[PDB]
Design a protein around this ligand. Structure first.
Ligand code: HEM
Ligand code: HEM
Ligand SMILES: [Cl-]
Ligand SMILES: [Cl-]
Ligand code: NA
Ligand code: NA
Lengths: 713, 713
């Protein structure tokens, strides 16, 4: 059946904003996962998981009689898709069970792992999500094998359809770099927002870069990809050596024996894939990666044997039975146990990427320290494993259950606790009037609150106005935030705050985070008054102010908006058209296409553009909240043409006279071009729409101000 | 960016069931279009539309100073996409404004038409939908030009994204037949459900079949496509001759001057397309179809000139200025006015397809009768124009406003009015107890009500249990309805009905339509009792019984289910796999994926399968309302394989013994294979889900029973 995507493959795609509707959700509109999970008997689930670890099923027999290694890999792959660039990927939505991730080649045979967990999932039902179960199972694996984890939080609600994620442009699984859709350019520069070296890999190629088995070069790809998943050298080494303390790889025969991935398999395979014609197709005969390496002498027990082997031997390049490059210990005895035959033993073996931990000079220093001090290793790994598996969960307020670690970690972007009474409705009214009496304009107030709140992204639940990090490095210096203007607004609000807090009794006080948001509320109300409309904008206090010492400046860098169509901002020139970036930003803000539309048209006329650009400001009453953006955009009395200076800037001229009326960017004009977005703009551009426009604008403003308010819980 | 569709282009697509969510809708979820329209000042709208007809805009000047022809075509294209096979297409959703229809080649320059209407749309806003406005505008164009219409109903609510319709498999616009994706096979047999001859055309090619200018062969395509749009010979001649009483075609220069269709045009075109480099690109210089034909001596006034020309001249094959085949009157004087230059006149001209009305023997007879009796022509065209523009609106209870014709037409599938008291709750309980005391089984009751209600389709709002048409021809004889079983049930229910009605006073009676539905509800209730559960099934009386004379048997044939996965039925063997057909049927029933899932699992265990097949009946307590389908489907203790006799039937065997436990079809097993469907199945197959299953089942059952209840209004 030919589709619109076939006819117009470059048309903007809005369907990403309409995933996750109530249509596709099987749970009731009132289902609250946190409430279900809080009553789960977590100790009973962990006991069932523990029993499972050594209860082998014949359709996928357990290596060494223990599924621990398999489950650790499952949990590390669930978490391992995460990219800091956009926050997308990660374990927080259980996306490993849907396409494409369920059929990525790096996820081969994790379909067996997830099916082993069905009887438990079935037993506990809605009280434990698949998302939480995948991580929990990895923790119980570790614990059952003598490793003390750092803790665990529940709260990852299940999802019901695939996320629309850009995973690269290659059309062939695992394609080596340098092809027509290469994700590399220049001196091995991986394109943002990607965080893996080949399509369908978690991070790197275990043979080495594009299969070249050089540990030194592989180390470069390790460091680059892991940094793109928010891990530094210490954490990287800890995680890789930690993981590879357990279990084994599977490459017992040629890969051509392995059939279709789960999405391509026949209906009779009932959601499983990679069926293998090699011998029994499983157990002793399994083929997963094609590598056949077993790292330690006790693959089902925590040890420091990974580094004892890594440094205790010299390594020789060899081939697995499937033909893949891997390494074997020179002159060693057969000390490694076999997974099924107690009379067989094997020499120590390593991946190219394991050897990176010894041959890259910076990793070698860490690895030696871990080898000499295995208690340091165990602590690094436990911390790193926690971070890995929690990094997309958002603020600690979302963390559920009895095993949440009490230690507050910098990477969590922590918010201090509130320990005083909050402002009430009458206080909020008083503060809004004081803000408006100070002389701050609608434009300033809107732009500042927008800047503070719109760093949120629903992909990993980072950002938002909570914390007042807009006043700290690096947010205060981001170009989009207009640093000099920002500093003047913040100085005025901080003097308001000081005066209000100094007059209170009873310890009542207002945070600057709350006041920034409340002041934006005042600006929106004032804008509405300017247009002849009395409205109240909702406001919920309870935000707190974080310090500079609680703010990791390097980690915050990825939240810098380099494109924010809502402020008609583009930091530089990108390959992707600006309207595509607008829709991407709307997705991260959790906005539907109607919400995106109303919000953008309102912000234009409120003076939210960076630099006070007139692009898209289609009103003669700037700082009044009206539908003028839509009414003027849609006026067929105006003709639009790209300018000679810049193809991405358009002039709107009266069609009859030639007189210049407006200028706009692609982000403005897409609302009059795209057929779905224009249908939206027409509703808000209609003569009966002033009331609806105002109401819907206020609702979406408030939604944005509250995106990170997980304390309202 | 590579997508799941690119990796697995044959995977079943569920996103068609999740279009039209509250996410993409800009209106509040309480918006009720019927209420808005009922308050519209329709007379005022019509005055504005009258004014518009002769208010020419310089960016698309009006032919002959009157846009009436352009608007008639616009309205006929809006309605013209309709197919009786599935009810999809038609004017009822205003889909001409979205992709692909806004950019079909047959819809060239209708973008200009729609844009002329924006100011009226804007002025009246949400009180008149685009969908209603396009048809209303066509009516007003007719009335402005001297033709009295049969009436008009509002009520077509706007939609906000494209519908997923199969329009064909060709990858080239307008591709002629016999290609790798040909829509024709054999002796010019058009594949169901299609109703046009080439991709991007409304019905037929105006030059003739695959461009061969033979009016006799063009007639055959006309008759076949128009029959597929619910029109017979008389209606077809009336509509073509009626339409081509007005306006003109546009082909003033080569088609290569015409640039990108609206979905491919630059952003500066603001939603318009087909920009032409030929001379002024518009007006006198316009190019739409490439033909240059003006049919009558008064193109802006109703006349009887179409048939005077058709029969009064002999015709000669010639070419338009763009190279297209058309016909010119031999020896005629230059009597046809020019659209812009008062000093220029033209000879009469015709399309190949106009000449079909004279050279096809059956059409010639009708055309002559219309030529001789122009009042018959006028009346036929008026009725046909009404049908064309209303055929997808559904029952008359949906018709709004003060111009609705009082005459009840056969094609509306009329239901008599109810003129007596309805049964109350005590009566419903008494009837359900009588039904259960009669000996009718759960399986019978559920099957019968399912058969009655599931003929509904949301595409044109035809079908459903209202009318009790299941008792009439042809529904009573449909194989899927199990005619012998059906007769026995109906005989028992008719005796219950007669005895209840005969004991009433005060005029109270129950219709058979209501009793069929009520008896199904009793079956569901009894099934719940069988499983140890009290349950209440809602029921709303008020259905009436239609007569055989109110039930057009030929028109009803298109509602016959040749595939109904909800009853594990497939009438023969089709090209499209059975699970794709299941999703298609769910879409027509208006079901989401979770609703489809619960409903199918429940129907299986209640005995709704045609022929009492055991396929998918994964329970040892048939006729009990349980979640057994999901629990058993998901049991990894069973291994599935296709049978040798039939690749589309599967055997489920105990994995450890080889013993046969179940059999199933693709429709059963897809719930265990497709990664999104399996996630839904898991929710209903979990240990905590029995009550959820029951409740969700009853809800969707009730939804199905009420799909045609537009009287509950
Ligand atoms: C450079 C990074 C890494 C590379 C290239 C990599 C590579 C691989 C490969 C190729 C396999 C074999 C799959 C098979 O054939 O079954 C695997 C197994 C495994 N990996 Fe990694 N790994 C990396 C990091 C990690 C991390 C961060 C962890 C967890 C902290 C992890 C834990 C495991 C475990 C436990 C197994 C064993 C699976 C089993 O016993 O079935 N690995 N690794
Ligand atoms: C066999 C069926 C039909 C064929 C093949 C056909 C073909 C066409 C073509 C090629 C045009 C010229 C488009 C352009 O170049 O501007 C057109 C114009 C038009 N058609 Fe038809 N037509 C058919 C049936 C209809 C019907 C059923 C109606 C209405 C009841 C209709 C009403 C019109 C009118 C009013 C125009 C003139 C447009 C103008 O003045 O801008 N036609 N037709
Ligand atoms: Cl994601
Ligand atoms: Cl449709
Ligand atoms: Na994420
Ligand atoms: Na339809």
């Amino acid at each position: 059946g030919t589709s619109n995507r076939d006819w117009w493959p470059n048309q903007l795609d809005l369907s990403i904003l309409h995933r996750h509707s109530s249509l596709s959700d099987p749970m009731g509109k009132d289902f609250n996962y946190a409430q279900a999970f809080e009553k789960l008997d977590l100790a009973a689930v962990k006991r069932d998981l523990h029993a499972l670890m050594t209860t082998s099923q014949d359709w996928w027999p357990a290596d060494f009689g223990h599924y621990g290694g398999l489950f650790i890999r499952m949990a590390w792959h669930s978490a391992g898709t995460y990219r800091t660039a956009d926050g997308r990927g990660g374990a927080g939505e259980g996306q490993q069970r849907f396409a494409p991730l369920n059929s990525w080649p790096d996820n081969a045979n994790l379909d067996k792992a997830r099916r082993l967990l069905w009887p438990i999932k079935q037993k506990y039902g809605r009280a434990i999500s698949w998302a939480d179960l995948l991580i929990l199972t990895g923790n119980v694996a570790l614990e059952s094998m003598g490793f003390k984890t750092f803790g665990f939080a529940g709260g990852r609600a299940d999802t019901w359809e695939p996320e629309d994620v850009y995973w690269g442009s290659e059309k062939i699984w695992l394609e080596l770099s340098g092809g027509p859709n290469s994700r590399y350019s220049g001196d091995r520069q991986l394109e943002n927002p990607l965080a893996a070296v080949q399509m369908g890999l978690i991070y790197v190629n275990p043979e080495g870069p594009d299969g070249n088995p050089d540990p030194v070069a592989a180390a470069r790809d390790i460091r680059d990809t892991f940094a793109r998943m928010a891990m530094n050298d210490e954490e990287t080494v800890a995680l890789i050596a930690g993981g590879h303390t357990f279990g084994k790889t599977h490459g017992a025969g040629p890969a051509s024996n392995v059939g279709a991935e789960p999405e391509a398999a026949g209906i009779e395979a009932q959601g499983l894939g990679w069926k293998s014609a090699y011998r029994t197709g499983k157990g002793a005969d399994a083929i997963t990666s094609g590598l056949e390496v077993t790292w330690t002498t006790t693959p089902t027990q925590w040890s420091h044997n990974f580094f004892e082997n890594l440094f205790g031997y010299e390594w020789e390049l060899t081939k697995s039975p499937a033909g893949a490059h891997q390494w074997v210990a020179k002159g060693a005895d057969a000390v490694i146990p076999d997974a099924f035959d107690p009379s067989k033993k094997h020499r120590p073996t390593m991946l190219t990427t394991d050897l990176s931990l010894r041959f890259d000079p910076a990793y070698e220093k860490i690895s030696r320290r871990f080898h000499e001090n295995p208690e340091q290793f165990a602590d690094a790994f436990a911390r790193a494993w926690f971070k890995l598996t929690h990094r997309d969960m958002g603020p600690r307020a979302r963390y559920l259950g009895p095993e949440v670690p009490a230690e507050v970690l910098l990477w969590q972007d922590p918010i201090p606790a509130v320990d005083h009474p909050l402002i009430d409705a009458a206080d909020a009214a008083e503060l809004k009037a004081k803000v408006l009496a100070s002389g701050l304009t609608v434009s300033q107030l809107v732009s500042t609150a927008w800047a503070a709140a719109s760093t949120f992204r629903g992909s990993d639940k980072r950002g938002g106005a909570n914390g007042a990090r807009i006043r700290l490095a690096p947010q205060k210096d981001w170009e989009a935030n207009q640093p000099e203007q920002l500093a003047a607004v913040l100085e005025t609000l901080e003097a308001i705050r000081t005066a209000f807090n100094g007059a209170q009794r009873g310890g009542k006080q207002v945070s600057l985070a709350d006041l920034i948001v409340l002041a934006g509320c005042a600006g929106v109300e004032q804008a509405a008054k300017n247009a002849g409309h009395a409205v109240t904008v909702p406001f919920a206090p309870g935000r707190a102010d974080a310090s500079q010492e609680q703010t990791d400046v390097e980690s915050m860098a990825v939240l810098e908006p380099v494109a924010d169509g809502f402020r008609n901002y583009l930091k530089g020139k990108y390959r992707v058209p600006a309207e595509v970036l607008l829709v991407d930003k709307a997705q991260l803000l959790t906005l539907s296409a109607p919400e995106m539309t109303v919000l953008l048209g309102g912000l234009r006329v409120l003076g939210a553009n960076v630099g006070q650009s007139r692009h898209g400001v289609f009103t003669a009453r700037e700082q009044a909240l009206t539908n003028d953006f839509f009414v003027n955009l849609l006026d067929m009395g105006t003709e639009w043409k790209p300018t000679a200076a810049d193809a991405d800037v358009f002039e709107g001229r009266d069609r009859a006279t030639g007189e210049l009326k407006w200028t706009g960017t692609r982000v403005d004009l897409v609302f009059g071009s795209h057929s779905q977005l224009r249908a939206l703009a027409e509703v808000y551009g209609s003569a009966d729409a002033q009331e609806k426009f105002v109401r819907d604008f206020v609702a979406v403003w408030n939604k944005v101000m509250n995106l990170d308010r997980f304390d309202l819980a």
